[PDB]
Design a binder for this molecule. Structure first.
Ligand SMILES: COCCN1CCC(C(=O)N=O)(S(=O)(=O)c2ccc(Oc3ccc(OC(F)(F)F)cc3)cc2)CC1
Ligand SMILES: [Ca+2]
Ligand SMILES: [Ca+2]
Ligand SMILES: [Zn+2]
Ligand SMILES: [Zn+2]
Length: 164
């Protein structure tokens, strides 16, 4: 009948996410705003759009957990692993998990939830790690400097190579 795409990518442009639970470290508003901004990084340079769902099954299910949390990628307590996300697909596909033994912030302290979420949602949409140290998809955390976060070129090229 019909073929799979040549990459792990969503075939639909409208995607849904659900924030399953919340970190102690930030208010519900702070987390929601961080995630909204993180999805905006990718929607601003592609045809993709994101709607939040408050319950049920979203494409991208977002949760905070520690140690064993229901997959083969258990967390390791404070430091080390910060988060992980699954490539586009059914079920766990697209889901994003955040280690709640980390200190999450809206600031320069601890780990900035926005930057990590933006990175992880790259994964949720089909980007793997970049080798370019300036890239958002570089697998090392750094906190930014300029106030208006600008998605690096490598990440722009990468996401566009999947969705236009
Ligand atoms: C044991 O070694 C760990 C091996 N792994 C690679 C790192 C890691 C991962 O990439 N998972 O997706 S991770 O340390 O939890 C991690 C997660 C998000 C990040 O998000 C970023 C990325 C770049 C940033 O920098 C920039 F903003 F300047 F671009 C900021 C946050 C940075 C690091 C887990 C798996
Ligand atoms: Ca950890
Ligand atoms: Ca999913
Ligand atoms: Zn997990
Ligand atoms: Zn990563």
């Amino acid at each position: 009948y019909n073929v799979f795409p040549r990459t792990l990518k969503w075939s639909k442009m409208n995607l849904t996410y659900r924030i399953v639970n919340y970190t102690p470290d930030m208010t519900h508003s702070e987390v929601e705003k961080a995630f909204k901004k993180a999805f905006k990084v990718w929607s601003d340079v592609t045809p993709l759009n994101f709607t939040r769902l408050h319950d049920g099954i979203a494409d991208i299910m977002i949760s905070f957990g520690i140690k064993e949390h229901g997959d083969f990628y258990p967390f390791d307590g404070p430091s080390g692993l910060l988060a992980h996300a699954f490539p586009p697909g059914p079920n766990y596909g697209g889901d994003a998990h955040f280690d709640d033994d980390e200190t999450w912030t809206s600031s320069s302290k601890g780990y900035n939830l926005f930057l990590v979420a933006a990175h992880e949602f790259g994964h949720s949409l089909g980007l793997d790690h970049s080798k370019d140290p300036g890239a958002l998809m570089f697998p090392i955390y750094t906190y930014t400097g300029k106030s208006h976060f600008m998605l690096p070129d490598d990440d722009v090229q990468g996401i566009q190579s999947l969705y236009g």
